[PDB]
Write a structure and sequence with these properties.
Two copies of one chain form a homodimer. With 320 residues, chain A is α/β, with parallel strands linked by helices. In chain A, 34% of the residues lie in helices and 16% in strands. A seven-stranded parallel sheet of chain A has the order 8-7-6-9-10-11-12, with helices on both faces. Chains A, B: Pathway: One-carbon metabolism; formaldehyde assimilation via serine pathway.
């Protein structure tokens, strides 16, 4: 029975497969694993299963016990792992890049609906016990049906958003540098725009599902906001650094933007302090893939990786 | 210009039409209208536009000056008007009963979604600055796709809901007293249940869209709850007296029900005190029809009834 260190508690179905295959050292999270704990514990274990929370920079990869020739990361990304360093040392890394499409689409829909319908301010009025009863002008939002949704980025997640968005009778327009199949645009009656500027124009609702690129970093800013229709509503579930916070906070205040629904922020969890008191925001602590079905696919996937190192085959989601 | 009293501030478009055709006394919500003030002011005007907040029962219809033979209620119901006493005294009464179907279906879908995805808890974590950053078990809920939705009451709102739910890939099973036409059912691949019980049994998510009626009043109680799957989620946008508050607070606390998303409460705004603290609830201050598109259809309809009275024609939404 090979031994593995699991740095954080995962969903029970994941943990249980792990314990039916390995001698697991499961760490809790109260006082999360410090890297030095990992480096230490690493010596009694054959393999690591880490989260994006363990930042394995070159320095740390070089500090790792030579016992370990396997790191599975419970994540879609690997921004926290030096894959070069791992590769030179012959440390094989894999990841868990599936099972989060629908879950994220759902949250993008939720944020669009909750923003049109002022759910955050609703919740507050009740919890805070400041509800005087129904009046005709109290927390009045707007309906989604026959409003235009501009989706920037029309891949798996942007497409599943369009599915859930056509159920509310929204009109779906998009821009991506990859134009989807005709068979596909038809599926959603999605209108392609060959330019971002062309899309911002028609976008009463705007969804950032775009890939982060140095060139697209902070693109959502003052100049981009002024191309949106007045009182436009923007949601972001992609990458917090696609948005320039100062300019978003300023337009929400000016009403240039009606509402914002953000799942991800630049600098999370130390999000720009302006967000906290803005009443026209609906804000989540990165719970895009926070669904049990998603969180277990990721875990079974991170387990598949380990399985295939110890089985002597190629890692199913081979990063290194 | 015939004078009218409008008891509450209404949307901007409706107020504008009102003051086009009428000399309007507009009463603010600052210190809301009291009955006496309404009675005193009815002497100086030709008709009343009131809301559901003005309870015009017999003892108040008794006080009404002989000049008022017109009453329009910005409201879908008329529980607050003694329609008899009105007929007896020759007072013609109409309501505004359209333009809330989609708005309410949206709010029912938002509560199903924000419940599965624990949206109230997210907003609370951000706003309180209690967010430690992403972790695999932070605020994990469940996806809606391929889950079964049970709808109690397949009217207009029930079917705008099934539409919006089949976009999230839910399976709609339903119970209504009069089974729906063969074509409705196909629209939504809905599955008919010949009893509420055989419906309750399959309902991982459950939506009360039933009418408030002697037999349905307080129908949702411990014996119904136990008939649902373990940890089902229940939303109610219909009426608060359809739900036995004591037995839902208990079952939510047991975990017998996972979540409840409610728009309406027995006693609102004086809702059961044991809701405020429950973390597995997503709760709104009754904003099922709080979209500016609905709120304005409603006041145009309410103005319609007054145009007809002064025209010699029947009110379009004649109650009495």
């Amino acid at each position: 029975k090979k031994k593995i260190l699991i740095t954080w508690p995962l969903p029970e179905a994941a943990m249980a497969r792990a314990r039916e295959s390995y001698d697991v050292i499961a760490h809790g999270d109260d006082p999360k694993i410090t890297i030095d704990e990992m480096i230490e514990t690493a010596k009694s274990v054959d393999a690591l299963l880490i989260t994006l929370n363990e930042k394995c920079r070159k320095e740390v990869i070089d500090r790792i016990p030579e016992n370990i020739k396997c790191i599975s990361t419970y994540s879609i990304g690997f921004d926290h792992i030096d894959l070069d360093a791992c590769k030179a040392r012959g440390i094989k890394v894999g990841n868990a890049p599936h099972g989060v499409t629908v879950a994220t689409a759902e949250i993008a829909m939720l944020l669009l609906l909750g923003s049109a319908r002022r759910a955050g301010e609703g919740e507050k009025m009740i919890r805070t016990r400041s509800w005087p009863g129904w009046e005709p002008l109290e927390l009045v939002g707007e309906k989604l049906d026959n409003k235009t949704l501009g989706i920037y980025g029309f891949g798996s997640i942007g497409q599943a958003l369009a599915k859930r968005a056509q159920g509310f009778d929204m009109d779906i327009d998009y821009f991506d540098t990859h134009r989807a199949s005709s068979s596909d645009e038809a599926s959603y009656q999605a209108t392609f725009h060959d330019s971002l500027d062309s899309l911002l124009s028609v976008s009463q609702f705007f969804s950032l599902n775009a890939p982060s690129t140095p060139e697209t970093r902070y693109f959502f800013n003052k100049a981009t906001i002024k191309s949106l229709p007045q009182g436009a509503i923007v949601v972001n579930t992609a990458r917090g650094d696609l948005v320039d916070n100062e300019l978003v906070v300023a337009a929400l205040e000016a009403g240039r933007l009606a509402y914002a629904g953000f799942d991800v922020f630049a600098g999370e969890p130390n999000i720009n302090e302006g967000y906290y008191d803005l009443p026209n925001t609906f804000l989540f602590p990165h719970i895009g893939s926070a669904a049990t079905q998603a969180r277990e696919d990721m875990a079974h996937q991170a387990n598949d990786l380990i399985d295939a190192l110890f089985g002597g085959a190629d890692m199913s989601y081979a990063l290194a």
